Every structure is written in C-alpha cells, then in structure tokens.
C-alpha cells in the first residue's frame, strides 16, 4: 500500500503544479487578447456614426 501511495502522490503533485502555472494564465491571456479587439469594434462604430 505504501509503494503505491508513493507513486500516486507523485502523479497528483505534478497535476496541481500544471493547472496552476500553465492552464489558468493561458485562459487569462487569450481572454484579454480577444477583449481588446472586441471593445474597439463597438466603440469605433459610434465614432463612425457621429462623423
């Protein structure tokens, strides 16, 4: 039981580190990139209308 416990904890430890460092910041950066383009399409339109 010990030897197995020793192997499984090593895998569970890698997964926490992976989701924390890689996954979450990728979701932040991608969201942001798209946000910045997106708001500008709505704004420029209003300026076009006004002109």
């Amino acid at each position: 039981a010990f030897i197995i416990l020793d192997e499984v904890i090593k895998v569970t430890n890698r997964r926490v580190n992976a989701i924390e460092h890689v996954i979450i910041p990728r979701t932040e950066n991608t969201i942001a990139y798209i946000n910045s383009e997106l708001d500008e399409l709505d704004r420029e339109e209003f300026y076009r209308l006004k002109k």
Partner: protein, 593 residues
C-alpha cells in the same frame, strides 16, 4: 448678457456671446443653474449645465459671473463641510431645511455674514510687496493661525492702504495695492482657478520627514511627505477605516478630506465621527474637525462638482503649502473621478478613447500628482511646506486592467496593497512587501539615519526577513517540517514578530493611535538583535526548542510593546527595549553554554 438659442439634452447653447471665454462660469437662465463653457462656435457658446434644466426656456438671459470656475480660499475654512465647487453644505442644511442643495438654489462659496479679527503682518504704507508675503493672519485653531493672509499671486505693487488690527467683514476691504493705477481692493478671501496650479519658489524631491502615526507605512517602506501613493480599494475592504485613521493619527497641520463622488454613507461618518474623536497632539474645540477642512461629494452630486473635487482640495493644500504648513491630502477615489469624465464626454459627443475611457485621462491624472509635493513656499520669508497625496483607485470595469488604476501606478513611486483578509483578521492597514514598493525610500531612510535612528540598515534587513519566510512556508506545505533546520525555523519566528508588532493594529491603546518615530525604531532594533544571536547560537550547539523555553519572559515583552507606553526610558525612547539588549546578550551566554 447672452440669450439662449437652444437647449439640447443637458446642454445649453446660447447666442450673443462676444466675450465668453472657454473656462467661464455662467448662470444660465433665471433659474441660475451652474454651467461652464466647453466650446464656442461662432457667436454661440456650448455650455454643459450640471444642474437639472427642467424649467429652463429659450430667449432667457445668460449672465456671466465674470470669471471661470474657481474656489474662494478665505478664512473660516475649518469646521465646514463643502461641495467640490465649494458652497457650504452646512448653511444649506439650516436655511433651505434640506440637507443637499436642490436645483436653482445657490449660495456664496463661503459664509459671508461671518466677521474675523484681522491682525497685520509685517507690511506698512508705501512699502513694496510681492506674492506669497504675509500681510496678516487670522486664527481658526487655538494651535496655529490656519489662515495666513497672503498677498494674492498675480499681484504685486506698493500698498496705498493698510487697514490696522480690528474686526472686518469678508466683504469689507483691508488692502489696496497700486500697480498701474489701482490694481483693485482686496479682501480676506482671495479667488483662485481650480485647474491652474499655484506658482511656488521651487519644488524639490519629496523627503521631508513626518509620520502619519501608522508604523507599518514608515517601517516596511518609508512613508513620504510630498509623496504620491496609490492604494487598491473595492469599497468594502476596509479602505474607508484606514482613511479616518490616517487623518486622525497624523501630526500634520491640516488634513484635507476629499470624497470625490462617494457612497454618501461614508461621508456621513466623517462629518460626525471626527468631532467625537480627540487629537493625538492635543487640542479642543471640535478636535479632528478643527484641523480638517472637508470636501464631500456623493456620487449623485453634479458631475462637475465631483470632477472639480480633486482639483479643489489640492488647491487648498498648495495654498497652505505656500503658507509654510504641511497638509495631508486624502482622496477616495480617483476611479470615481475618472468615471465622471466618461459621463461628460459621452453627454457632449466628445470621443473617448481606450476601453471607452477618455483620451483626456492620462494627461489629467498626471497634471494632478505634480501639484502635490514638497516645495519651498512662495513669498520672501521662505518656509518649507509639503502636500502628501494619497489617492484610492478601484476597478472601473470590474477589472484592475482599467485605464485608471494602471495609469496611476506608472506615475506613482509608492504602491501599497490592501487586503480583505488582513482587515477581517484585524490588521488595518494591510500592506505586505509583495504587493508594494516605494522608490522614495532611499532618500527617506537616509534622512532618518541622521536624527538618531539606525533606520537604513534596519529596514533593508526587515524586507528580506519577510520575503525569505514566504519561501520557507512553501516547504512546510509540501515536505513538512522534517526538512527544515533550527535556523529556518528562527526566520519564521522573527517574521511573525515583525508582522505582529507593525502590521497588526486596530487602535488597541492610545499607543497604536499614535506612535512616534522612536518607538518604530526600537521595535525593529529588538527583532534583528534577537535574529543574529539566535541563529549564531544554533550554529554553536543549540536548538530552537531550547531558545524558546529560555527566552520566555524577554520574548513576550517585545511582542507586547505596542500596548505599553514608549515613554519608559525617557519620554518617547522606550525603556522596555533599551533593557532588552542587555537581557538578550545574557540570554545568549546561557544559550550557547
């Protein structure tokens, strides 16, 4: 003067303008709503009218006040609550019998039935006079003469008329200056444009040493006067609590509180609580209120008054800076000031820019901070005064990526974090060395190093101990405590002390309420002293467990210093610390052996 041609939405357009300038304050119609001239096309002027125009018509008169949007800085400024364009709230509460000021009702910018006793300064008939020179003073405090009457800037000449000592009305004159004929008469109150910064002899790097009486600012990353500081808010993280603390505990001459466009429930608290509260440097006569001049706009108040707010407060502080007093400027919050700008642009059809937020934003936020600072005071005596700016910022889009928070962090050299967690745990403020920096720090500590404190050495060593500890906590989580030595465990203990003694406060005693420079100094001296000996002794054959059982009485004593008087050794240098050095040395002989 003018005649109204059209009124479209909140905006009034008026013809027969042959002499309206584009900053002028005007009273529109017969309802005398407040308005200011944004643009001029031809003989037609564009005015944004900030106060409700339901009842207003076309063909009605437009009467200029004859000057831009300005604030009057006169005497009687203390123990009054104002708006950001400045009109006494208090006088409206009595007269109108309504707390807030409703449409079409206006009052002079200060009370005018009030009379003051004017004493002369150092001038006499026929002597030459210049800007910033003290022509007389008025008391308002029984601590200081808050209103020094200075000669107006943009005014100089030879004085044809000096009134003597005696009591005069605000309307009544006391000075005439001859400078290309009669320049004008002058009165106690002088006028000053909000967006125009006062002239000064010269501004200097922010370095003037004074406390805010909150230890953690000073200890972790030296608190600065003439500084610029941003603090993150979220309107229930305890920012409002530290603002009332920051205002009381300080030893500065005045505090100017600016509620830029706030809840109004927070503004209600500052009105009432501050006269209840008592000075930490002595004085009666409504203590905190007497030292404080209060500008209060809630979020519902005209977009102009909120917009003016930050400018108007900083103007009162700069003027006093010129007087040679140290003033603290506390603003909550520049995110509400920014928002208001968005409102005005949108109402005009003036294009905003990035994130829907004005293009006007960057340059304006920057214009404001540069007014704040250390200066040598305008006029011939030459004095030092300072204005310290603390501005709260908060999300403006529900993100911290908002143009405002990110623009201000660039301009500022001080950043101090603020947390929900530490506030629930009863540490107020909430500054940690991971969410802060101060680049002003090198000059401040240096200044402190001169006076008696060993400050620079101590402070670098303090930052490092809290940093190194964080890393040592991560090991406790993963591996546990079976891979940490006596020396690493010791780092943790010292760090807990630094945090306990400085960061955690809540007004436990009238020793947390005010702390001098000396008590801050003695606390850290004690922690480093223990750190070096303790680690040395474990290297020489001792254990953390051993150190702990013997240290006992001396170690609890340094933790509790914050409840006790600092006045034990002398009068502000603490005896509980001075004796500790000897006991800690003695402690270490026993520990090694």
């Amino acid at each position: 003067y003018g005649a109204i041609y059209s009124v479209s939405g909140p905006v009034v357009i008026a013809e027969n303008m042959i002499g309206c300038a584009m900053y002028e304050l005007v009273k529109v119609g017969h309802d005398n709503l407040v308005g200011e001239v944004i643009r001029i096309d031809g003989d037609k002027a564009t005015i944004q009218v900030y106060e409700e125009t339901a009842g207003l018509t076309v063909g009605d008169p437009v009467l200029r006040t004859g000057k831009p949007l300005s604030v009057e800085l006169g005497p009687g400024l203390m123990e009054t609550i104002y708006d950001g364009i400045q009109r006494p709230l208090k006088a409206i509460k009595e007269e109108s019998q309504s707390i807030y000021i409703p449409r079409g009702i206006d009052t002079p910018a200060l009370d005018r039935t009030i009379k003051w006793q004017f004493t002369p300064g150092k001038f006499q008939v026929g002597d030459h006079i210049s800007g910033g020179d003290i022509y007389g003073s008025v008391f308002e405090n029984s601590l200081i003469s808050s209103h020094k009457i200075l000669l107006p800037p943009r005014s100089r000449g030879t004085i044809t008329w000096i009134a003597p000592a005696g009591e005069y009305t605000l309307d009544e004159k006391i000075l005439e200056v001859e400078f290309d004929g009669k320049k004008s008469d002058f009165t106690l109150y002088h006028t000053w444009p909000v967006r125009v910064p006062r002239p000064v002899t010269e501004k200097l790097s922010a370095d003037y040493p004074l406390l805010t009486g909150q230890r953690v600012l000073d200890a972790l990353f030296p608190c600065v006067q003439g500084g610029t500081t941003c603090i993150p808010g979220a309107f229930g993280c305890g920012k409002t609590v530290i603002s009332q603390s920051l205002s009381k505990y300080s030893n500065s001459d005045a505090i100017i509180y600016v509620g830029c466009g706030e809840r109004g429930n927070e503004m209600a608290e500052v009105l009432m609580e501050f006269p209840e509260l008592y000075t930490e440097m002595s004085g009666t006569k409504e203590p905190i209120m007497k030292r404080t001049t209060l500008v209060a706009n809630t979020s519902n108040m005209p977009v102009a008054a909120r917009e003016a707010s930050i400018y108007t407060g900083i103007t009162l502080a700069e003027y006093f800076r010129d007087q040679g007093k140290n003033v603290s400027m506390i603003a909550d919050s520049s995110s509400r000031w920014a928002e208001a700008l968005r409102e005005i642009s949108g109402r005009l059809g003036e294009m905003p820019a990035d994130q829907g937020f004005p293009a006007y934003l960057g340059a304006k936020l920057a214009s404001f901070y540069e007014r704040a600072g250390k200066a040598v005071a305008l006029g011939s005596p030459d004095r030092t005064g300072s204005v310290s700016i603390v501005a709260a910022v908060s999300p403006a889009g529900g993100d911290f990526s908002d143009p405002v928070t990110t623009a201000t962090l660039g301009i500022t050299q001080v950043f101090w974090g603020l947390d929900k967690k530490l506030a629930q745990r009863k540490h107020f403020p909430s500054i940690n060395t991971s969410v802060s920096y101060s680049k002003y720090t090198n000059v401040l500590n240096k200044f402190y190093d001169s006076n008696y404190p060993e400050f620079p050495v101590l402070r670098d060593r303090m930052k490092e101990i809290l940093s190194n500890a964080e890393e040592l906590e991560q090991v406790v989580q993963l591996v546990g405590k079976s891979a940490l030595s006596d020396s690493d465990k010791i780092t943790l203990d010292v760090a807990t002390l630094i945090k306990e003694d400085f960061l955690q406060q809540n007004g436990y005693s009238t020793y947390d309420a005010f702390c001098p420079i000396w008590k801050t100094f003695d606390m850290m001296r004690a922690f480093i002293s223990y750190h070096d000996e303790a680690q040395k002794a474990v290297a020489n054959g001792a254990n953390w467990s051993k150190l702990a059982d013997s240290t006992g009485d001396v170690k609890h004593a340094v933790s509790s210093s914050k409840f006790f008087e600092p006045s034990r050794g002398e009068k502000e240098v603490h005896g509980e610390f001075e004796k500790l050095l000897s006991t800690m040395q003695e402690r270490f002989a026993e520990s090694t052996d």
